[PDB]
Design a protein around this ligand. Structure first.
Ligand code: CLA
Ligand code: CLA
Ligand code: CLA
Ligand code: CLA
Ligand code: CLA
Ligand code: CLA
Ligand code: CLA
Ligand SMILES: CCCCCCCCCCCCCCCCCC(=O)OC[C@H](CO[C@@H]1O[C@H](CO)[C@H](O)[C@H](O)[C@H]1O)OC(=O)CCCCCCCCCCCCCCCCC
Ligand SMILES: CCCCCCCCCCCCCCCC(=O)OC[C@H](COP(=O)(O)OC[C@@H](O)CO)OC(=O)CCCCCCCCCCCCCCC
Ligand SMILES: CC1=C(/C=C/C(C)=C\C=C/C(C)=C/C=C/C=C(C)/C=C/C=C(C)/C=C/C2=C(C)CCCC2(C)C)C(C)(C)CCC1
Ligand SMILES: CC1=C(C/C=C(\C)CCC[C@H](C)CCC[C@H](C)CCCC(C)C)C(=O)c2ccccc2C1=O
Ligand code: SF4
Lengths: 124, 80, 41, 143, 147, 740, 83
């Protein structure tokens, strides 16, 4: 109820409007793909930096990439669990059960694609 | 929700209803007391079990008793 | 006088008086009988 | 009272800014409570969900998420200005329930029209032991 | 704890051969704190250090672990329900009124733990920390200098 | 407009109310019937807001109580000076301050406690004092015991005068409410007279008395052969020989040629190499400048002569667009509510005490103060704890003001109303900040401990593996080391030795030296910030939710100090603002304990020690760079490596520290039964004891009852704080006296 | 201090300028109020023969201000090597 200049800013409003979570202009698969790509690309960062094999060149990036892929898979499993255990009962298709399942599938597809993209960028 | 039970030792002093912060008790006509009033709980589903009515009871032991159990959204005092 | 006496008749004041009396008695006993342990007349 | 009043959503709210401890998502999922009163003049009162507001000269309508907040506002208005307000409960489907003045005379009075329920007719301490009521689902105080 | 302190100190002084140390040291609590809880804990605390590590590193780690669970028991026993319930209400508002995170929701409303539940959780943390701390100290002191 | 308003004899000096214990409140006026009355007698004694609703009587009681506390303080100071006059070796300490320990408390040989009178040196036996009173008296020019005797007698006389003043200003001539409400006159007189005039008087004492005595003491002459301060005051030849500018005789002051005063009003920032303290000329010019600034500031507010500033006009004028009524109703709040002023005073007093502790360990403003490591450690810890207690009492009395003296009529859209209106966002953001700080500090510590126990020193957050160096603190240290070089060229050296430079040592012991900052220092500083943030969150949640909340909407009607609201809504135990302060007291204790542990370890490892020809050999050998990064390092290299002096102190003069250590452990453990448990168990136990005494017909007429839940919480937190404080006190003092 | 010294001359000039400012608008005084401009106020203190709002506290305040400005100017000019 308490409106604030930062919450009601038009720049903030249009920045949150075109986000994949609040766009409401596409299938949940595309939003999940974008979410997985972005979050996997950022999550690969701390893993290629400070892992136990960070002193060993070459293998550090590979180990961090598989750790990021495992974290992405764990997040996808928790997303699927939340979708199955949250929307099991009675206009946005994301809030639906199978819509959230498709969102989770897009999320894991985007996560592995972003992990592979981060591996390519670190190799180059 | 919780269970509010009122016994015949009540003197109809209306202190429990004034101490109630959720409007659970009420005063009904009676003949077993000098004040001709008896406490009732027609809205026990809204009681949270705060035991504020028991503090205001002037009689020895308690003429009104609150027993907790089977908490709900109204009984847990949740605004969410 | 009697109001001050009843103030002195209050429980903390007489407790303080007992405290000084008992502490002084035990301290003077310990001072004039340095470190005893066993009753030997 | 003689006739149960009907709430009016078009009644003006008291002059107030933005509240942080206001209605949450439970207001659009479960029931929420609405308090109405009749202020003869404009004055400043303290809400239980935040700071202070100013009521308008006329009908005044406020919304809360808890019945305890509604009764706290009711007793504050009765003790400070003798306002005698009344709050309804509105569910998600729009069902309106009259809550505080069930007979319109407030629970401090009697009105000789309320049937006393949940009243044990025995003295406290005369209840049976829990061994007497076992594997039955009936508490010693529920008989 | 008292009976195990007595058993451990008496038996340790018997195995070391310095029974006179226990005889002249268990009289006063400085002896209990220094000759038992401080003298015999030298090998325990040196399990891991910047110098290196000996075989009692796991015992030092679980000793600090037990002290930590003791502190969490103090947390769940000292503070009571009203403060945590109000804090949970504020966190509920924070989760409700945020972008990019209010899309998710809880199936069950988060509430503070019950007072009986709080007593049980504090008791469990207290006893777990007690058991782990004394087991660590006992095993590290009896095995670090004997066999 | 501003004038003295005094009522003549409103209260008669009669002992008729001393006989009745419960008289200030009508609840206790009926007499006692249970034992919980007695505690209620000792709990509502100073609750003057509950005794009467009249602000004038409350203000008169506050004035009288302040006079009584000043009398008590002056009695304590006079007793300290008397103990320094008679049962002390101050004259022996003046001959050789680097070899005779300061002692001012002597015990009576009664039951073997005469072993506490240790060999402090100078042919004296007593307890080694850590108050630093010897260094304060040396900084004040005190030489003989006659001056200490005169100061003690004057302190007793002024204490009696203040005690009579309290009696007079309450019973005989009681000021009215309009007299107390003149905040502009109070501020003007306090800025100009209480602070500025006292600063000028102390500056004049330093110029005319303290500087020549300190200069002659640093010259190495006999203190008995030092001329008396009145010889410097009257005869100008000695003061001209010691300082040629005194030969001018007030000429440069009234001719604006103040540079001629540069010989005895210096700017040589740093430590005096002779004594390891601050330069007395620098302190003289400092107090003179402070006096000038405060006399300037004391002519700011308008009282009776047209010119000046109006506090209400200033507060109402400072209103922005994002705040609505900016500082609108605060003038009426602070002129009617005593508790708001109490919160402000306690917060600023505690913060200033913390500042005093930090800037006193940094610059020792006393001769031979830094050499005495125990005095510096005790003073830092004492001011630290007093500041913490004051800043938690600030939150307590702010919550009391929120419950009692808050009026929604005067706060519609002002700043307090908007703070209440977004308190939930405030508490949520503070909770997130506290959780993030605790994670990224304590989890870092746990990470270091695990990777140390896993045999991975290269995976640790240490000074050798992962360099999380404090680049901002190091940059500030480097900039302040170059402060006299470019930005303050008139200073001879740096303002303190902590920024950098060389090592200043006195008598072979290092007085001050540069302090290096590493990853462990960053970790402990962020830990301190986290603990302060959590305590701030607790106290702010207590203050802002004192009136109402989502859980309890009518918390204001329940009062400030209530135990609970029953087990309803899941349970409302410890929901009051008083319980919030009771919870935050432990967090303040934990924060300040970690702070003083960091101070003691850091100054023992990287500051204190001895100075040999090879270099500076510290007390602990500088292990803080390698041991402070893990919890086990604090467990072993700080708590177990130290505290061996406390446990081995038996049979020596330090054995009282070990006994006090054991008693403090006892009180800390005994507090937990009040912190845990409840009331019904002890009530039924008391019922059983009542049955036992009724069998023997020795049941008291006053019914024994268990302590209240609020009372039990208060007893628990008080015994817990006392036990922890005395444990740290005994351990710190024994360690710093035996090895220091 | 010394009669004829530059410091004496400029501090006498500063004190006289402060007094002249207080006499005619300019510097705020006992009879001058408000933050942006100066508005007439009550006489507060009898001026004892002085025309307009010029009382004893006015000359005390503005003599103090003139001495402060003069000593600040003197020490600032001495710091920069000037008069
Ligand atoms: C509850 C256990 C307990 C017992 C049995 C004793 C008994 C004794 N202690 Mg101990 N003591 C205790 C607790 C105890 N104390 C505690 C808790 C402390 C710490 C505060 C001390 C501190 C202490 C010291 C420092 C000393 C003693 C001494 C003594 C002796 C008593 C001297 C006395 O009071 O004058 C005798 C007084 C009377 C007989 C009273 C007579 C009154 C009328 C006539 C009857 C005696 C051997 C003293 C001693 O001689 O050591 C052996 C001594 O120096 N004790
Ligand atoms: C420049 C004048 C002056 C001075 C020096 C003081 C000094 C003081 N005031 Mg006060 N005050 C003044 C004017 C002054 N006041 C005016 C004009 C008002 C009315 C608007 C007040 C209203 C006021 C209140 C409401 C309170 C104080 C309090 C205090 C004390 C603060 C505690 C402290 O710092 O301890 C410093 C202590 C010392 C330096 C020790 C020596 C103290 C000596 C005896 C005081 C001498 C100064 C005295 C004002 C001279 C006039 C009194 C004379 C008739 C004998 C302190 C003694 C507090 C108090 O009650 O404390 C008792 C308090 O609550 N003041
Ligand atoms: C509060 C602080 C303080 C005090 C008390 C003093 C006091 C003193 N200083 Mg110091 N001084 C100070 C601050 C202070 N100064 C500061 C800040 C500086 C700046 C650097 C100096 C710099 C300085 C220098 C350089 C010298 C002094 C000197 C002096 C002495 C000369 C006094 C004088 O002529 O002044 C003016 C004093 C009066 C006008 C007297 C006051 C009026 C009297 C009390 C009236 C009494 C009337 C009474 C009713 C009648 C008597 C009653 C009886 C019959 C019962 C004096 C002992 C000089 C010195 O020691 O040589 C002697 C000296 O060389 N001082
Ligand atoms: C500037 C100083 C100052 C002043 C003037 C006040 C004034 C007041 N406070 Mg505040 N307070 C302060 C500082 C101050 N406080 C600080 C620093 C704290 C934090 C510790 C608090 C915490 C606090 C709370 C939590 C409460 C108050 C309350 C009160 C009121 C009554 C106090 C009373 O009756 O106590 C009577 C005196 C006692 C109860 C004695 C206390 C003794 C303590 C517990 C133990 C002392 C240990 C001692 C150091 C060592 C003993 C060892 C032993 C072996 C002898 C009064 C308005 C109460 C109130 O109702 O406010 C309106 C209240 O609930 N205050
Ligand atoms: C050492 C014991 C301990 C610990 C860990 C905590 C932890 C906490 N308390 Mg505290 N508390 C304690 C004792 C303790 N308390 C005691 C004794 C009291 C009584 C005075 C209190 C009183 C108290 C109050 C009054 C408040 C807290 C708050 C908090 C929270 C602050 C979060 C934070 O900054 O750290 C983050 C948490 C940690 C660093 C925990 C350390 C454990 C590791 C490092 C985390 C990861 C563990 C592991 C890797 C994951 C395992 C996964 C799976 C196997 C389980 C957090 C939940 C505040 C709150 O609610 O939040 C702001 C608050 O208001 N507590
Ligand atoms: C961690 C913070 C911190 C601290 C404690 C210090 C402390 C110090 N610095 Mg450093 N400094 C800092 C950060 C800090 N600095 C950051 C920079 C980079 C920009 C510098 C750059 C710097 C330089 C270049 C120099 C110092 C110097 C100094 C010294 C004197 C400074 C002085 O006169 O302050 C003022 C002293 C006071 C007592 C004023 C306190 C005022 C109080 C708190 C009230 C303030 C209210 C405020 C005005 C209201 C806010 C208004 C706002 C809304 C507009 C002192 C040792 C000087 C030095 O070398 O020492 C001789 C020096 O030359 N500092
Ligand atoms: C003619 C105008 C004038 C000039 C050129 C100066 C110049 C100076 N003054 Mg000054 N000042 C002036 C007027 C002036 N002031 C007035 C009118 C006042 C009274 C309000 C002051 C009050 C004042 C103070 C209080 C201080 C200075 C200081 C300074 C120095 C600050 C610049 C510096 O060192 O680098 C930056 C410099 C020597 C400072 C100083 O001592 O530095 C040497 C200092 O502390 N001045
Ligand atoms: C008049 C006159 O001479 O009064 C002289 C006064 C009072 O003198 C008498 O006192 C009696 C009560 O003891 C009555 O009040 C009498 O009416 C009164 O004349 O005598 C004194 O000794 C003054 C008080 C000294 C103590 C002051 C303590 C104040 C509190 C500080 C703490
Ligand atoms: C970290 C803490 C961030 C708090 C942000 C809100 C501060 C509270 C707030 O709303 O402040 C708003 C304030 C501007 O408000 P106004 O200029 O209208 O306030 C003027 C009155 O205070 C007089 O902005 C700042 O102070 C900027 C720095 C914030 C830091
Ligand atoms: C025109 C006229 C006239 C004249 C007048 C005159 C001429 C006057 C003057 C006056 C004056 C001429 C005054 C002055 C004053 C001054 C002052 C008052 C100042 C100061 C003071 C002080 C005290 C100071 C201080 C200080 C110091 C020391 C340090 C710091 C700074 C300062 C400076 C602040 C006649 C009457 C004939 C006639 C009519 C008109
Ligand atoms: C133990 C306990 C009690 C019982 C404690 C009581 C009744 C207080 C007892 C105080 C005693 C009477 C103080 C005096 C003790 C000695 C008799 C005095 C000194 C004697 C020597 C000088 C000889 C509570 O009432 C309680 C309430 C709420 C939370 C926790 C607790 C709690 O832990
Ligand atoms: S408070 Fe007790 S006696 Fe009074 S009306 Fe209620 S049940 Fe009856």
């Amino acid at each position: 109820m308490l409106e604030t200049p930062v919450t009601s800013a038009p720049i903030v409003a249009n920045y949150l409007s075109n986000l994949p979570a609040y766009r409401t202009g596409v299938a949940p698969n595309l939003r999940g793909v974008e979410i997985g790509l972005a979050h996997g690309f950022l999550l690969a960062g701390p893993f290629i930096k400070l892992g136990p094999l960070r002193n060993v060149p070459g293998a550090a990036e590979v180990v961090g990439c598989m750790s990021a892929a495992g974290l992405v898979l764990i997040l996808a499993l928790c997303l699927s669990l939340y979708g199955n255990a949250a929307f099991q009962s009675t206009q946005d298709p994301l809030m639906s059960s199978e819509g959230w399942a498709k969102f989770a599938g897009g999320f894991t597809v985007g996560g592995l694609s972003g992990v592979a993209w981060a591996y390519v960028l670190t190799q180059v | 929700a919780h269970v509010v039970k009122i016994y015949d030792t009540c003197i109809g002093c209306t202190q429990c209803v004034r101490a109630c912060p959720l409007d659970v008790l009420e005063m009904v006509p009676w003949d077993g007391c000098k004040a001709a009033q008896m406490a009732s709980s027609p809205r026990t589903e809204d009681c949270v079990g705060c035991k504020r009515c028991e503090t205001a009871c002037p009689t020895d032991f308690l003429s009104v008793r609150v027993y907790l159990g089977n908490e709900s959204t109204r009984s847990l005092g949740l605004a969410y | 006088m009697k109001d001050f006496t009843t103030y002195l008749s209050t429980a903390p004041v007489v407790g303080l008086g007992w405290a000084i009396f008992t502490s002084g008695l035990l301290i003077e006993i310990n001072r004039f009988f340095p470190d005893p342990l066993v009753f030997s007349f | 009272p003689w006739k149960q009043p009907e709430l009016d959503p078009d009644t003006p709210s008291p002059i107030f800014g933005g509240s942080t401890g206001g209605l949450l998502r439970k207001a659009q999922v479960e029931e929420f409570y609405v308090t109405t009163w009749e202020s003869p003049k404009e004055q400043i009162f303290e809400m239980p969900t935040g700071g202070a507001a100013i009521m308008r000269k006329g009908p005044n309508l406020l919304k809360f998420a808890r019945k305890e907040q509604c009764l706290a506002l009711t007793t504050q208005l009765r003790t400070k200005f003798k306002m005698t307000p009344c709050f309804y409960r509105v569910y998600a489907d729009g069902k309106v329930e009259y809550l505080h003045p069930k007979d319109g005379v407030y629970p401090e009075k009697v009105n000789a029209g309320r049937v006393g329920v949940n009243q044990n007719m025995r003295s406290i301490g005369e209840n049976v032991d829990p061994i007497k009521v076992k594997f039955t689902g009936s508490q010693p105080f529920t008989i | 704890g008292w009976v195990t302190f007595y058993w451990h100190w008496k038996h340790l002084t018997l195995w070391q051969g310095n029974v006179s140390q226990f005889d002249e040291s268990s009289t006063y609590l400085m002896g209990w704190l220094r000759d038992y809880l401080w003298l015999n804990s030298s090998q325990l605390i040196n399990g891991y250090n910047p110098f290196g590590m000996n075989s009692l590193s796991v015992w030092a780690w679980t000793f600090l672990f037990g002290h930590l669970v003791y502190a969490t028991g103090f947390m769940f026993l000292i503070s009571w329900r009203g403060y945590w319930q109000e804090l949970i209400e504020t966190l509920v508002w924070a989760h409700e009124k945020t972008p990019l995170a209010n899309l998710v929701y809880w199936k069950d409303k988060p509430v503070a733990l019950s007072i009986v539940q709080a007593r049980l959780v504090g008791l469990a943390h207290f006893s777990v920390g007690y058991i782990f701390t004394y087991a660590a100290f006992l095993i590290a002191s009896t095995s670090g200098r004997f066999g | 407009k501003v004038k003295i308003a005094v009522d003549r004899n409103p209260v008669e000096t009669n002992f008729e109310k001393w006989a009745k214990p419960g008289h200030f409140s009508r609840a206790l006026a009926k007499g006692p019937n249970t034992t919980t009355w007695i505690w209620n007698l000792h709990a509502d004694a100073h609750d003057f807001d509950n005794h009467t609703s009249d602000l004038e009587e409350i203000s008169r009681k506050v004035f009288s109580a302040h006079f009584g506390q000043l009398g008590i303080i002056l009695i304590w100071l006079s007793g300290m000076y008397f103990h320094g006059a008679r049962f002390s070796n101050y004259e022996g300490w003046l001959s050789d301050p680097t070899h005779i320990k300061p002692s001012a408390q002597v015990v009576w040989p009664i039951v073997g406690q005469e072993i506490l009178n240790g060999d402090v040196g100078g042919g004296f036996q007593g307890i080694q004092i850590t108050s630093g009173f010897f260094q304060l008296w040396r900084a004040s020019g005190i030489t003989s015991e006659l001056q200490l005797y005169s100061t003690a007698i004057g302190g007793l006389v002024l204490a009696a005068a203040c005690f009579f003043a309290g009696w007079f200003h309450y019973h005989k001539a009681a000021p009215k409410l309009e007299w107390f409400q003149n905040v502009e006159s109070m501020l003007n007189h306090h800025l100009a007279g209480l602070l500025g005039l006292g600063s000028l008087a102390w500056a004049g004492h330093q110029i005319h008395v303290s500087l020549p005595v300190n200069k002659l003491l640093d010259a190495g002459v006999d203190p008995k052969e030092i001329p008396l301060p009145h010889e410097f005051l009257l005869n100008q030849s000695i003061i001209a020989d010691l300082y040629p500018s005194f030969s001018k005789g007030l000429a440069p002051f009234f001719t604006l040629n103040w540079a001629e005063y540069s010989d005895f009003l210096t700017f040589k920032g740093g430590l005096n190499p002779v004594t390891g303290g601050l330069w007395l000329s620098d302190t003289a010019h400092h107090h003179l400048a402070i006096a000038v600034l405060f006399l300037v500031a004391g002519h700011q507010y308008r009282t009776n002569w047209g010119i000046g500033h109006s506090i209400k006009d200033i507060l109402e004028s400072h209103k922005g667009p994002f705040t609505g009524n900016g500082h609108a109703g605060l003038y009426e709040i602070l002129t009617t509510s005593w508790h708001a002023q109490l919160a402000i005073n306690l917060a600023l007093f505690g913060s200033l005490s913390i500042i005093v502790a930090h800037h006193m360990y940094a610059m020792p403003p006393y001769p031979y103060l830094a050499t005495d490591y125990g005095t510096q450690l005790s003073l830092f810890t004492h001011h630290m704890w007093i500041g913490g207690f004051c800043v938690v009492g600030a939150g307590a009395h702010a919550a009391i003001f929120m419950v009692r003296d808050y009026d929604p009529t005067n706060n519609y859209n002002n700043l307090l109303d908007r703070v209440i209106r977004h308190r939930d966002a405030i508490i949520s953001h503070l909770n997130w900040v506290s959780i993030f700080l605790g994670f990224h500090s304590f989890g870092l510590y746990i990470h270091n401990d695990t990777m140390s126990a896993l045999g991975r020193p290269q995976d640790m957050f240490s000074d050798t593996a992962i360099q999380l160096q404090p680049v901002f603190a190091q940059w500030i240290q480097n900039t302040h080391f170059t402060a006299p070089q470019l930005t303050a060229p008139n200073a001879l050296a740096a303002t303190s030795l902590t920024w950098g430079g060389d090592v200043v040592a006195v008598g072979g012991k290092v007085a001050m030296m540069p302090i290096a900052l590493g990853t462990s220092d960053f970790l402990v500083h962020h830990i301190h910030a986290f603990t302060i943030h959590v305590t701030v969150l607790i106290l702010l949640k207590g203050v802002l939710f004192a009136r109402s909340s989502r859980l309890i909407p009518d918390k204001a009607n329940l009062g400030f100090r209530f135990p609970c609201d029953g087990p309803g809504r899941g349970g409302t135990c410890q929901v009051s603002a008083w319980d919030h302060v009771f919870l935050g007291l432990f967090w303040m204790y934990n924060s300040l304990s970690i702070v003083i542990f960091h101070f003691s370890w850091k100054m023992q490892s990287d500051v204190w020690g001895t100075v040999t020809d090879s270099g500076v050999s510290h007390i602990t050998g500088g292990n803080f760079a390698q041991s402070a990064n893990t919890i086990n390092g604090w467990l072993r290299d700080f708590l177990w490596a130290q505290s061996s002096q406390v446990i081995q102190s038996y049979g020596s003069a330090l054995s009282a520290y070990g006994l006090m250590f054991l008693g403090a452990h006892f009180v800390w453990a005994f507090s937990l039964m009040f912190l845990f448990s409840g009331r019904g168990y002890w009530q039924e136990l008391i019922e059983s004891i009542v049955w036992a005494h009724n069998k023997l017909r020795v049941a008291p007429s006053i019914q024994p009852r268990a302590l209240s839940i609020t009372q039990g919480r208060a007893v628990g937190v008080a015994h817990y704080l006392l036990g922890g404080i005395a444990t740290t006190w005994s351990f710190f003092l024994a360690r710093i006296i035996a090895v220091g | 201090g010394f009669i004829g010294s530059p410091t004496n001359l400029i501090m006498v000039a500063s004190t006289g300028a402060c007094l002249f400012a207080s006499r005619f608008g300019l510097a705020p005084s006992v009879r001058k109020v408000a933050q942006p401009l100066k508005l007439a106020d009550r006489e507060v203190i009898q001026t004892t023969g002085d025309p307009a709002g010029f009382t004893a506290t006015d000359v005390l305040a503005m003599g103090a201000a003139g001495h402060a400005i003069g000593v600040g100017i003197v020490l600032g000019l001495k710091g920069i090597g000037q008069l």
